[PDB]
Structure formats: C-alpha cells, structure tokens
Amino acid sequence: ASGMIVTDAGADQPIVFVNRAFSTITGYAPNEVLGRNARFLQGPQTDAATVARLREAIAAARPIQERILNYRKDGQPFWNQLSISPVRDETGNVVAFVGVDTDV
Amino acid sequence: ASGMIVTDAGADQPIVFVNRAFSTITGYAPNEVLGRNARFLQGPQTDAATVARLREAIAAARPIQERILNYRKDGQPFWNQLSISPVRDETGNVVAFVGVDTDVTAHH
Numbered sequence: 001a002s003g004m005i006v007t008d009a010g011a012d013q014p015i016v017f018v019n020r021a022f023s024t025i026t027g028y029a030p031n032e033v034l035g036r037n038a039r040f041l042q043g044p045q046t047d048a049a050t051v052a053r054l055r056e057a058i059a060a061a062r063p064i065q066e067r068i069l070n071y072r073k074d075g076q077p078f079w080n081q082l083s084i085s086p087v088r089d090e091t092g093n094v095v096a097f098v099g100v101d102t103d104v
Numbered sequence: 105a106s107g108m109i110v111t112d113a114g115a116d117q118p119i120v121f122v123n124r125a126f127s128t129i130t131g132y133a134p135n136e137v138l139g140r141n142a143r144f145l146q147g148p149q150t151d152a153a154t155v156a157r158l159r160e161a162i163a164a165a166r167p168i169q170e171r172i173l174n175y176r177k178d179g180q181p182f183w184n185q186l187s188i189s190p191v192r193d194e195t196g197n198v199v200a201f202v203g204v205d206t207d208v209t210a211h212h
C-alpha cells in the first residue's frame with residue numbers, strides 16, 4: 001500500500017497526519033513524526049540536488065515527483081517514490097501539502 | 105481560513121483527519137467526526153441534486169467543487185464552498201480523498 005503524509009502549508013511544513021502504510025514503509029509510529037518536517041527521513045546517501053528540487057517546489061507550491069533515498073527508523077535505506085502536491089482552497093490559498101510514497 | 109477533511113478512499117470514506125479551521129467552521133471537535141462519513145454536515149435544506157453530484161463524483165474518484173448548505177454541530181446553517189479531490193499514487197490508485205471547506209455565508 002502507498003504511504004501518505006499530510007503537512008501544514010507554512011512554518012516548515014510540520015507533519016499533521018500519516019496513514020498506516022507510512023508506518024509500514026518507514027518503521028516510524030505517528031507519535032514519532034507528528035510536528036516534524038519530513039526531511040528526517042533523509043540521510044547520508046540522499047541526493048542533495050533531489051532535496052533542492054523538493055525545496056524549490058514546496059516554496060512555490062508546485063507539484064513534484066522524485067525518487068529519493070530515505071532511511072527507516074532502524075537506519076535501513078529505501079527508495080521513496082515520492083510525489084507532493086499542494087492542497088488549495090478555491091481562492092488558490094495553500095491549505096496543506098500531501099505527499100505519497102507510491103508502492104512499486 | 106479554509107477547513108480541510110481527509111478521508112479514507114474506500115468503503116464510505118470515513119474521516120481520518122481534520123485541520124483546526126474545520127472545527128472553527130463546523131463547531132465539531134476532531135473526536136466528534138473521526139470515523140464518520142462527512143454527510144453528517146448536511147441537513148433538511150441541503151440541495152439533493154448537489155449531494156447526488158458529490159456522490160457520483162466520489163464514487164468515480166473525480167474531483168468536484170460545489171457550494172452546498174451545511175450545518176454546524178449545534179444546527180446553525182452555513183454555505184460551504186466545498187472542493188473534493190482524490191489523492192492518487194503514481195499507479196493511479198486512490199490513497200485518500202481531501203476536501204476543502206470555505207464558509208461563504210454572505211453570517212453578520
């Protein structure tokens with residue numbers, strides 16, 4: 001099943017909701033991640049250029065997909081097939097971001 | 105501020121998360137709505153044709169926007185400028201639905 005992360009729009013996009021698959025994939029429980037920016041999933045071999053593309057897309061509220069190296073709670077690396085998009089109201093204000101880690 | 109509702113994709117879309125603005129707009133605390141289908145926001149003056157369009161769009165996982173009459177927990181009506189979209193993974197599987205609620209009542 002595909003993981004899902006919901007964040008606030010501002011103040012460094014703290015995580016406000018994760019689905020069950022997020023915990024299966026990453027080994028983190030919700031209480032270990034709520035209120036944190038999702039960048040804690042990154043580690044030593046994460047590609048800096050990929051991180052910079054995510055940073056620019058979120059700053060501009062642009063949809064983006066990246067295959068990014070992340071790390072489980074136990075330190076094991078995994079490929080995250082990540083897609084992020086903004087959630088907007090009908091006046092175009094960004095209410096939240098949603099990220100998905102696609103299962104295969 | 106606009107409310108946000110996240111639901112499960114399947115089996116009548118129970119609410120799994122609401123933001124703070126949802127509680128400001130609707131008068132419901134998260135405790136009072138988690139595990140429920142959002143249709144409890146509707147009431148006797150809600151337009152049935154609008155509800156039918158929402159039902160068919162959600163069943164098809166098609167994005168939809170409607171202005172719909174909804175009701176706060178204590179029964180006060182409000183007009184909801186509602187936008188619902190599926191959250192899809194890259195294979196096209198629906199992971200969740202997200203709804204954004206804006207109170208557009210012309211109240212005070």
Ligand SMILES: Cc1cc2nc3c(=O)[nH]c(=O)nc-3n(C[C@H](O)[C@H](O)[C@H](O)COP(=O)(O)O)c2cc1C
Pocket residue numbers: 005006007013037038039041042051052054055058068070080082084097098099100101
């Ligand atoms: C909704 C959402 C979900 C995210 N999920 C992930 C993720 O699963 N893995 C990851 O490495 N980064 C994820 N990010 C990206 C980081 O939070 C951060 O935006 C990125 O590392 C770039 O910013 P930085 O250079 O400030 O770290 C997510 C961001 C958002 C808004």
Ligand SMILES: Cc1cc2nc3c(=O)[nH]c(=O)nc-3n(C[C@H](O)[C@H](O)[C@H](O)COP(=O)(O)O)c2cc1C
Pocket residue numbers: 109110111117141142143145146155156158159162172174184186188201202203204205
């Ligand atoms: C994510 C999401 C958010 C929703 N938010 C609202 C809402 O704010 N107000 C509302 O009247 N219906 C809302 N609905 C629609 C109802 O849950 C339901 O789909 C609609 O009433 C049509 O189905 P029914 O005829 O079976 O009730 C939402 C649905 C989803 C999936």
